[PDB]
C-alpha cells in the first residue's frame, strides 16, 4: 500500500509542513494548517507523552511516505547498526531512492519522486531501479533514463528544488539530469525539527 488520500490533512494533524505539496504555494494558503482536521480542529490541548511520541513518529513516516511495517524495520536496522539509533534511522530514510530523487529535484514531491522511480524513469549506476525503498549508497549516480529526460514534470521539479535549500551531501547536474549521492547526510544536515529521540523511545515503550 501507499497512503493515497488527502495530503494537507496529515500536515494539519502533525501541526507542521511535511512538504507533501511542492512549495510553489505556501501550505497555509492551501489549508487551515494551524487547525487539525475535522470538526474538533480548533480544539487542541494536552497530549500525553505517548501521544507526543506517536505524533513525532508519524511526522517522520508521513514526510517520507513509509508505512509502519517498513518504518518499524528501519528502526530495527537503525538499532542493529553501530552508533546512534536515532541518527541511523534518519540516514536510512534519507538513503531511499524515492527520497534521493526528491532531494536531487527530479520530483517535486516525495510522491512524484516515487512515481518516477516506480514507472522506471530512474537509473542507479546506469541500471534501471524501480524500487522506491532501494538504498542509494555513497558515490552512487542517480540519473534519468533518456526516455524520461523529456518529461516536463521533471524540468518543473528542478526549478521547484531551486526554491529550497540545497543538500550539501548530494550533487546534481540538472542539465544532464544526473545526481551523485556524495555521502550519507549527517544529523546536522537534516531538519532539527525532527526529534529522532522520541521515535527511539516509542519503539521501546
Amino acid at each position: 500500500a501507499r497512503y493515497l488520500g488527502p495530503k494537507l490533512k496529515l500536515s494539519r494533524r502533525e501541526g507542521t509542513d511535511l512538504f507533501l505539496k511542492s512549495g510553489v504555494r505556501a501550505i497555509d494558503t492551501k489549508c487551515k494548517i494551524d487547525n487539525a482536521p475535522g470538526v474538533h480542529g480548533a480544539r487542541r490541548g494536552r497530549l500525553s507523552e505517548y501521544g507526543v511520541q506517536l505524533r513525532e513518529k508519524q511526522k517522520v513516516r508521513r514526510m517520507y511516505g513509509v508505512l509502519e511495517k517498513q518504518f518499524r524495520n528501519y528502526y530495527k536496522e537503525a538499532a542493529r547498526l553501530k552508533g546512534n539509533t536515532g541518527e541511523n534511522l534518519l540516514q536510512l530514510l534519507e538513503g531511499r531512492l524515492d527520497n534521493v530523487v526528491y532531494r536531487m529535484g527530479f520530483g517535486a514531491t516525495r510522491a512524484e519522486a516515487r512515481q518516477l522511480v516506480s514507472h522506471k524513469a530512474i537509473l542507479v549506476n546506469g541500471k534501471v531501479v524501480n524500487v522506491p525503498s532501494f538504498k542509494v549508497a555513497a558515490n552512487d549516480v542517480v540519473s534519468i533514463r533518456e526516455k524520461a529526460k523529456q518529461q516536463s514534470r521533471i524540468k518543473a521539479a528542478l526549478e521547484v528544488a531551486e526554491q529550497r535549500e540545497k543538500p550539501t551531501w548530494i550533487e546534481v547536474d540538472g542539465g544532464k539530469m544526473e545526481g551523485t549521492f556524495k555521502r550519507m547526510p549527517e544529523r546536522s544536515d537534516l531538519s532539527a525539527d525532527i526529534n529522532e529521540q522520541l521515535i527511539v523511545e516509542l519503539y521501546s515503550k
Binding site: 507523552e49 539509533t85 536515532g86
Partner: protein
C-alpha cells in the same frame, strides 16, 4: 532556563461534618537540563494553585547531580519508601529508557541516555524521591579519584 514538568496531579479529600473538602496535589519537577534538578509537591483547593505552589517549592529545593555529558558516570540505585530505582549509563542514541515520573526527573535534569527500571512502589511521589536520591549518589571519576587520593587514570588502571 529551568524546564518545569508536572509529574502528577491528584485529587485528595478531607472528610468533614458537612461532606468532603476536595483538594489537589501537584507533583512537579524543575531543572536546568544540565545537572540541577528539584522536585516540588504543592497542595491547594484549585489545580493551578497546586501546580504553582509545587513549582515554587521545586525551584528552592534544586540540587546538583554529576552527569557525564547527558548520561550517568556509573550505575546507581535509589530507594524511598517502597520505591526502588535502578539507573544505568547508556550509549548516545538510547534515549531515556525510564518509566513514569522517573523519565520527567531525568528529562529536566539533562539526562538524555539512560537505562532505568523501577522496582517496588511506582507511586510518583516516592519514585521521584528515589530517583533524586540516586542521582545524588552519583560521583564523577574525578570526585572518586579525589577521595581515594589517586588520579582519574589510576582509578581506571
Amino acid at each position: 532556563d529551568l524546564q518545569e514538568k508536572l509529574i502528577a496531579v491528584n485529587r485528595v479529600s478531607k472528610t468533614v461534618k458537612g461532606g468532603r473538602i476536595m483538594s489537589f496535589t501537584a507533583l512537579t519537577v524543575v531543572g536546568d537540563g544540565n545537572g540541577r534538578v528539584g522536585f516540588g509537591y504543592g497542595k491547594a483547593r484549585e489545580v493551578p494553585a497546586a501546580i504553582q505552589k509545587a513549582m515554587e517549592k521545586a525551584r528552592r529545593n534544586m540540587t546538583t547531580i554529576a552527569l557525564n555529558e547527558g548520561t550517568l558516570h556509573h550505575p546507581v540505585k535509589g530507594r524511598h519508601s517502597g520505591s526502588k530505582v535502578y539507573m544505568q549509563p547508556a550509549a548516545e542514541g538510547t534515549g531515556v529508557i525510564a518509566g513514569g515520573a522517573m523519565r520527567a526527573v531525568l528529562e529536566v535534569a539533562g539526562v538524555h541516555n539512560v537505562l532505568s527500571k523501577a522496582y517496588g512502589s511506582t507511586n510518583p511521589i516516592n519514585i521521584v524521591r528515589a530517583t533524586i536520591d540516586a542521582l545524588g549518589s552519583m560521583k564523577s571519576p574525578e570526585m572518586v579519584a579525589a577521595k581515594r587520593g589517586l588520579t582519574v587514570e589510576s582509578i581506571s588502571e
